[PDB]
A paper describes a structure:
Here we use the evolution of a new essential subunit in the protein complex of the CO2-fixing enzyme Rubisco to understand the genetic and structural mechanisms that have maintained this interactions’ essentiality for over 2 billion years of evolution. Modern-day Form I Rubiscos assemble into a complex of eight catalytic large subunits (LSUs) and eight non-catalytic, accessory small subunits (SSUs, L8S8 complex). Even though more ancestral forms of Rubisco exist and are functional without the SSU, all known Form I Rubiscos are strictly dependent on a SSU for solubility and activity. In prior work, we used ancestral sequence reconstruction to resurrect ancestral Rubiscos that existed before and after the SSU first appeared (named AncL and AncLS, respectively).
The three substitutions (R269W, E271R, and L273N, abbreviated as REL) are localized in proximity to Rubisco’s dimer-dimer interface. Indeed, instead of forming an octamer, the AncL+7-based triple mutant AncL+7 REL was dimeric in the absence of AncSSU, as determined by mass photometry (MP). Even a single substitution (E271R) was sufficient to abolish octamer formation and led to ~60% reduced activity under assay conditions, whereas activity in presence of AncSSU was unchanged. We did, however, observe that the addition of known active site inhibitors of Rubisco, namely xylulose-1,5-bisphosphate (XuBP) or 2-carboxyarabinitol-bisphosphate (CABP), induced octamer formation in AncL+7 REL. A strong enough active site binder or very high concentrations of the protein can thus force AncL+7 REL into octamers, even though its native substrate RuBP cannot. This implied that there is a direct link between Rubiscos active site and the dimer-dimer interface and suggested that Form I Rubiscos need to be octameric to be fully catalytically active. In addition, we also noticed that AncL+7 REL (as well as all other constructs that form dimers instead of octamers without AncSSU) were drastically destabilized towards thermal denaturation (~30 °C), which was partially recovered by AncSSU addition. This implies that LSUs in dimers are less stable than LSUs associated into octamers.
Numbering used by the authors:
A (entry chain A): 6 to 453
B (entry chain B): 6 to 454
Write the structure that this text describes.
């Protein structure tokens, strides 16, 4: 034992280290404090997210730190690659992953900015997670909906509607052609719209639209609440009412409570829509935070049946190439690394079920060719304002959106160039769909 | 009903609005996309965090939007003030506050960066929250410790120690003078150290150190786990073993599970240490995120008995003036606005109990004058590496740290200027304490900016 401060890089930078298949790997984009070399900043991150602290401690000799320490094993420009032994992590706990990987290292004086870009979850650790409770293919079977994107939409105004008027809007949307509708992420239980009232009114409207259309419907009833116990109480009521779905804001509720609801959802046979509210607080800026592709991996591990991925073309920010990579991470059995999409690692998904991407936010009929081109069939497209903002209201808007999606799907199946002919495809459909004609006219001037 | 897209500012910018005492107020620092005026960007934030969306909807006429909409009511440079009616929020739910205020508005194309600086929680909403399960004054009575900062320290190395060796370090620290010790935030249950074993070994060491010193001791047993059910299972065992404390990483576990643990702690009579792991992921940068003072307010509302606040002088970033304001938000009954410290609003705490600030991270004996100057008596100072890194180990390090704090507190109560006379106060104590002498000698040239 030699007391005293040593540079972090002495113990935690090891560019000769060869990662094991069981290691968890991180790619961090590092902005060192001016004067601090990349090697020392990267080693600081490795040390303070695994075993080390700021000075040598006598108790380091009471264990084999060579067995347990994280190691920065590669630095490419400002990207540091760090390997973490499998033994460092609690089985089945995303919460533990976060507590190590993003716990303290984003606040060090020596590292002025830090962004977690990607993470390689090893198969041996992935096997301790349950994954989605339903999965894309089982969900399609429960809905009896194949060969096309699924249609949804958030009820608007976000807040302020009574339970009765809220369910009226739900009914009009489902009756007009949407497969699903959803509570806004911030609609939980409030004086103007209490959750028990909303759940009862809405399921009546869902049943009525299902009977009248002859198609299966769902509403994503938001069980997000102030405590885990309260969330599970709201889920139980949704199950009692025969809802196919519940919805959780998995980041604002938090991963521990999210895990509790996932367990409940699987055991009670309901599908779990996951809203990513708060994600942009820390995934927006390229110099600091956690890229969404990491959150998407953690989501698939805990188990959501859908998660929002962005639209690329709508009102909220989202890079096209990054979104294509995120879609693959959610849906495929194995995703090879791709620097063009910010996928720093190969990701084997170890047989876990796939997750539906959900494209929502500021989209309307003119975006449908782009969205089908981006996502293919296995996605939800959500039209909130793009449904209720139709000149003739929600039911007509739902018809316009549903017809537009089916027209573009048909064109793709016929081998047409759905981007090169997108407007022509929509105009053909509009000739026998007045609602689509009226939607195209209203929003023809609205781009982001 | 007029269909089509309107500017957000038409409905959601109201510079003549006078906030009500029941309103929830937010101060956002807004960086608009180039070409987007501040009024439109601020109105977009107000709209998309309350009632609006990107195009006019027929259902807007099915309610009274004027009664429920949020309104940007003042702009000062790049800071927009937004008022939210009380009816918009679910009683007792921080989760609901976040889902509205920070739910989607940080990801809009029209607003390239956004930072929530402060939030005025109105009294009528605050009354629906329970606050800390113990509180500073009740906690001091439970510990029978008065008139000084309390001493703690994280066990090191962070991970890798067996339960037996882990508790050996705990015992040496508590025996040497620390009031408490704690699990690292990332020590939960792992192959080298399972939580049931750790809880048993550690509580034996706590009881042994309490019997040999004659002073009450505690260890912050981390119950942070993958699910709410598992966290409550670990808390139960901590209570069965007679621990005074449990610990939760309230942000990585999340606020819904945090509230579940707070309720458990109050009902089972255990004190709740709250670690802010992950906070810097979104409170570090000045252009985008949520300032920690907002997280501190939410923490006191749900109810933690301590929360980390930073050290200012240690290894992790923290601004001195902002930290002074955060300490006041955690401890005082009422906190007036203070632009010089980033407190944009008066905050009435409506009778809620206060929270212990906790200063931890890279600090050693030379930082003690600054730490007592910044925080006063009602705080914990934690020395992890600053204890176990002593030339003669944890027991000697704990004595050095305890002696330094009591000397600086002594000199302060002696009318001395502990900042100007800091080096001399420590050296006077170093003459009668060789442990302190060796600590000061070892870390003399270890400085953080
Ligand atoms: O609150 C909203 O804005 C929405 O209901 C969209 O409403 P519109 O359909 O009326 O735009 C969705 O929650 C966002 O799209 C979520 O963003 P993301 O999908 O990027 O998480
Ligand atoms: O993991 C660590 O670094 C610590 O155990 C400090 O160890 P040392 O005492 O050896 O530095 C604490 O968790 C940090 O202080 C937390 O940061 P904050 O208090 O700013 O949340
Ligand atoms: Mg929404
Ligand atoms: Mg720690």
């Amino acid at each position: 034992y030699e007391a005293g401060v040593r540079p972090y890089r002495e113990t935690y930078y090891d560019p000769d280290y060869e990662p094991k298949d069981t290691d968890l790997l991180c790619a961090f984009r590092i902005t060192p404090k001016p004067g601090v070399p990349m090697e020392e900043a990267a080693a600081a991150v490795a040390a303070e997210s695994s075993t080390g602290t700021w000075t040598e401690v006598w108790s380091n000799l009471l264990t084999d730190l060579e067995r347990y320490k994280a190691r920065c094993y590669r630095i490419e420009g400002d990207v540091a690659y760090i390997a973490y032994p499998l033994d460092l992590f609690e089985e089945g706990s995303i919460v533990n992953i976060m507590s190590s990987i993003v716990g303290n290292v984003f606040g060090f004086k020596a590292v002025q900015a830090l962004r977690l870009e990607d993470m390689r979850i090893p198969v041996a650790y992935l096997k301790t997670f349950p994954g989605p409770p339903t999965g894309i293919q089982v969900e399609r079977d429960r809905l009896n909906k194949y060969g096309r994107p699924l249609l949804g939409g958030t009820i608007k105004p976000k807040l302020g509607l009574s339970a009765k008027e809220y369910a009226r809007v739900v009914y009009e949307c489902l009756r007009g052609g949407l497969d699903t509708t959803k509570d806004d992420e911030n609609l939980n239980s409030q004086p103007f719209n209490r959750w028990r009232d909303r759940f009862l009114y809405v399921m009546e409207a869902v049943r009525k639209a299902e009977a009248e259309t002859g198609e299966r419907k769902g509403h994503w009833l938001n069980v997000t609440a102030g405590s885990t116990e309260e969330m599970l109480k709201r889920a139980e009521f949704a199950a009692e009412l025969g809802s196919r779905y519940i919805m959780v804001d998995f980041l604002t509720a938090g991963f521990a409570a999210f895990a509790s609801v996932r367990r409940w959802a699987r055991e009670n046979g309901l599908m779990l829509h996951c809203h990513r509210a708060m994600h942009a607080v820390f995934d927006r800026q390229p110099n600091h935070g956690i890229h969404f592709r990491v959150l998407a991996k953690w989501l698939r591990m805990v188990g959501g049946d859908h998660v929002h991925t962005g639209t690329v073309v709508g009102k909220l920010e989202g890079d096209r190439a990054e979104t294509l990579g995120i879609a693959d991470l959610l849906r495929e059995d194995y995703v090879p690394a791709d620097p063009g999409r910010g996928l720093f690692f190969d990701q084997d998904w170890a047989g876990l079920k796939p997750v539906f991407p959900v494209a929502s936010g500021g989209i309307h009929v003119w975006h449908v060719p782009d969205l089908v081109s981006i996502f293919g069939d296995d996605a939800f497209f959500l039209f909130g304002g793009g449904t209720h903002g139709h000149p003739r209201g929600s039911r007509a808007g739902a018809t316009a959106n549903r017809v537009a999606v089916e027209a573009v799907v048909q064109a793709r199946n016929e081998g047409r160039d759905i981007l090169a002919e997108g407007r022509e495809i929509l105009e053909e459909a509009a000739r026998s769909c007045p609602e689509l004609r009226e939607a195209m006219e209203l929003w023809g001037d609205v781009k982001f």
